[PDB]
């Protein structure tokens, strides 16, 4: 069998799989009081992309299509195209277009457009509320709130580049975004379909290990924590390698390459998430040059050394 | 050193701990995709009541106090008293008054009242929407919708007796109640406090075992499934016995007394919930005289025989 492995990359060398920003740190905490079912950053260890996951980190939380002005307002409806500008097909066996945001919140960015006949261009501040009834990316429809009521042409290529998140600042700080609440991809009162499954630790004393970033904040007092289950580079690497899983669990050691010292060990479950032996909320303290090393296939009953 | 046990009672001889109706059956299913954090039917095996749990089966989802008419409506605000008509104290270390509903839904029942001076009485159809901003039992205020704007008197003892649940038949069938969504006990935009913890299986191949009833439906197409973690009789029994836990897990066998044969075994975790070894949704088929029997103290690493 082709040997399994994970990339030789430090945490800071890698990228969040749920928003186009670098990873910052490792975090673990209990999760029984919320549902951990992100759709980006989902990949089996033998390289099957799940949920809404696609390969490039720069397409995460972007949208492409043409826009229609909602007269009387500064709002525009975008009819979604595929990343390569091809027609988008709502009947594919996915929850939503690949790269669609997988949390409820207010994502701020910039809508840009080029007019093809003369090469004229324009960019405007834009916000997408993924909790809105007009957020229906699975059916190809997303509404943006912008700072213009006139600049954007119809039937011209238009792109949303995400920047960060905002919070209604007259409200209790850090109550949005809600990173563990999936959007309703087809709008109100419509069940999501074809989801990657929710994940949870399934061994005594274990917690999920999260790959954490801080999203930029553009207004108010947002909760900028963003946790993904797999670095985007691991998604990319498993897809490329396609090494078959020999058991349910790949045992990884986090090692300091200067000293060879193992700092902690963790379980990489073959369906694509990581657990550690710890109880409580904890920001891991790691050497900046540390990296993950696959050591052995184990079963689900392996007892990790406490971290 | 007092020996632990569970009562010798069949499933149909016991009572749901989350609504005043008998238990009907046993059910198991995966639970990573929702939060299992009920506040009624919560009790440790050594008899410590948790959440909003109290001992009386008939006080579950009941409210008592005086009512104030909401001028212009057929609605009344009940100013809550304790279940024994004493003053209610919002500063106790509980999430809400004991027996408060622990799910978001529309509970229909009857508001009754007696006039102290002459013994005149009155009763009216009433509904409490536990997802309402005006559902704030932690602060002693609960709004009822009734069919009168003038019959109830001020400063007179008033009781809500629950009957069942309703759904808006003009909307998708079985979309409410939501038995795994806690109310906001202090109203809009206010965090719940002092909750009994969420629960989850913590061993490979295990699922929660649920004690299931069917709530009466009073209108529309409600989801009447109601799952509790412990029968109300087990809450009552553990409270009375107060037997100390000798380990984290009491191993129970479900035995058929007609044959003496064990049908399945399960783990009763000392913090007060049950797991079984099974994968998938399953309605347990059990003999009518079967009951649970405590056999030995084990730990969270014990491998159960497949259910």
């Amino acid at each position, epitope marked *: 069998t082709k040997p399994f492995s994970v990339p030789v990359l430090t945490v800071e060398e890698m990228t969040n799989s749920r928003f186009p920003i670098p990873l910052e740190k490792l975090f673990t905490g209990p999760s029984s009081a919320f549902v951990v079912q992100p759709q980006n950053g989902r990949c089996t260890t033998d390289g099957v992309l799940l949920g809404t996951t696609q390969l490039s980190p720069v397409n995460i939380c972007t949208f492409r299509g043409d826009v229609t002005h909602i007269t009387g307002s500064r709002n525009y409806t975008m009819n979604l195209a595929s990343q390569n500008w091809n*027609d988008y097909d*709502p009947t594919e066996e996915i929850p939503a277009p690949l790269g669609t945001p997988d949390f409820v919140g207010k994502i701020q960015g910039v809508l840009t457009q080029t007019t093809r006949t003369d090469g004229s261009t324009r960019g405007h501040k834009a916000t997408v509320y993924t909790g809105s009834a007009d957020f229906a990316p699975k*059916l190809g*429809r997303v509404q943006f709130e912008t700072d213009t009521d006139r600049d954007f042409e119809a039937n011209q290529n238009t792109k949303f580049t995400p920047v960060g998140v905002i919070q209604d600042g007259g409200t209790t700080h850090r109550n949005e975004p809600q990173q563990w609440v999936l959007p309703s991809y*087809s709008g109100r009162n*419509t*069940h999501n379909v*074809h989801l990657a499954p929710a994940v949870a630790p399934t061994f005594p004393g274990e917690q999920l290990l999260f790959f954490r970033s801080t999203m930029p904040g553009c207004s108010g007092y947002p909760n900028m924590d963003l946790d993904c289950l797999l670095p985007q580079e691991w998604v990319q690497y498993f897809y490329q390698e396609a090494a078959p899983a020999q058991s349910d669990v790949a045992l990884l050691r986090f090692v300091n390459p200067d000293t060879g010292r193992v700092l902690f060990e963790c379980k990489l479950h073959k369906s694509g998430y990581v657990t550690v032996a710890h109880t409580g909320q904890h920001d891991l303290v790691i050497p900046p040059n540390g990296y993950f090393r696959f050591d052995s296939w184990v079963n689900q009953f392996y007892t990790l050394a406490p971290m | 050193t007092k020996p632990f046990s569970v009562p010798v009672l069949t499933v149909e001889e016991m009572t749901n701990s989350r609504f005043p109706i008998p238990l009907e059956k046993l059910f198991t299913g995966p639970s990573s995709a929702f939060v299992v954090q009920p506040q009624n039917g919560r009790c440790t095996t050594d008899g410590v009541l948790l959440g909003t749990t109290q001992l009386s089966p008939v006080n579950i989802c009941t409210f008592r106090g005086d009512v104030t008419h909401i001028t212009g409506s057929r609605n009344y605000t009940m100013n809550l008293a304790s279940q024994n008509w004493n003053d209610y104290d919002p500063t106790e270390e509980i999430p809400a008054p004991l027996g408060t509903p622990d799910f978001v839904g529309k509970i229909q029942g009857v508001l009754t009242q007696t006039t102290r001076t002459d013994g005149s009485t009155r009763g009216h159809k009433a509904t409490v929407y536990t997802g309402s901003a005006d559902f704030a039992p932690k602060l002693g205020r609960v709004q009822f919708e009734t069919d009168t704007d003038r019959d109830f008197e001020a400063n007179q003892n008033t009781k809500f007796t629950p009957v069942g649940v309703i759904q808006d038949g003009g909307t*998708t069938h079985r979309n409410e109640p939501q038995q795994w969504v806690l109310p906001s006990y202090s109203g809009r935009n206010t965090h719940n406090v002092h909750l009994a913890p969420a629960v989850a299986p913590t061993f490979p191949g295990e699922q929660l075992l649920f004690f299931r009833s069917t709530m009466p439906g009073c209108s529309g197409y409600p989801n009447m499934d109601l799952d509790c973690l412990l029968p109300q009789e087990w809450v009552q029994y553990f409270y009375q016995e107060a037997a100390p836990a000798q380990s984290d897990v009491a191993l129970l066998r479900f035995v058929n007394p007609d044959t003496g044969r064990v049908l399945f075994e399960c783990k009763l975790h000392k913090s007060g919930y049950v797991t079984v070894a099974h994968t998938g949704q399953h309605d347990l088929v059990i003999p009518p005289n079967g009951y649970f029997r405590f056999d030995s103290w084990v730990n969270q690493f014990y491998t159960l025989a497949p259910m």
Partner: nanobody
Amino acid sequence: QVQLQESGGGLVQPGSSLRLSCAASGFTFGGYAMHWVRQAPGKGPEWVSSINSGGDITNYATSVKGRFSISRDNPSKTLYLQMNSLRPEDSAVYYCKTQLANRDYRGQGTQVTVSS
């Protein structure tokens, strides 16, 4: 079991209008997005139209936008496609399809020929 049954196809002149129906059973219908897809002779199936549970979100293939209208009646669990200004290239078998959890379901279809 989930069941979908289309109806209303036939042979019609270019420029005319035609309404297709799809009767659904075996699931709540409400709560689920529904779609129309079509398969022309010698080609694979292609998306035509989509609608969410309440009907407040709809979308259409570029080739039928402005001419087709999708709608639904959830109490009777019926999906509809109103087709106007029909063209020869609209000729195809039309299917209703849905997705529930991680499985897709499609009806047997109804034939529509647009020809003089």
